[PDB]
Design a protein around this ligand. Structure first.
Ligand code: NA
Lengths: 101, 86
């Protein structure tokens, strides 16, 4: 099996808030530095996209990011209700089930 | 429609962008590896379609989104999100 899906359900250790944060390529490593502050509650999906499981209002997170990276920074923050995904990295698969629930 | 965010790894960015063109003005590219799509499509169907076309071993994430907040220099993204999301 390499296809998976989660309804990102707030049950037990899985927090209520499910966020996908996207920046432009130019700002990739700056956003990564910031995202690492959320510890095991985030994962980097690509150079410019992260998933974060945190109970934070998206507008509040946006203000927090803009205060740190600059008010003219591009960012998109989505609240997600599901995820459907594929990988062949057996180790990333395990991180992901637990992170997604 | 449904509101989807599609993410791929950096190594597949060109292939994904070519695929995403089929969705016309209903998609916008957010970064080299992320798109927004406003489309009535079942995420597993979209996944099967991408894997049949880009390769079965391809990493991909498709999220269903319920809200977006953004600040952007990309006029096409701003317009697409503000008009289509809801
Ligand atoms: Na097809």
């Amino acid at each position: 099996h390499h296809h998976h899906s989660s309804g990102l359900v707030p049950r037990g250790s899985h927090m209520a808030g499910n966020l996908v944060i996207v920046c432009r390529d130019q700002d990739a490593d700056a956003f990564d530095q910031l995202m690492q502050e959320y510890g095991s509650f985030q994962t980097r999906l690509s150079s410019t996209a992260w998933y974060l499981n945190m109970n934070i209002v998206p507008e509040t997170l946006q203000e927090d990011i803009l205060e740190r990276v600059g008010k003219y920074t591009t960012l998109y923050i989505f609240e997600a209700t599901s995820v459907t995904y594929n990988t062949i990295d057996s180790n990333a698969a395990e991180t992901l089930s637990t992170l997604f629930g």
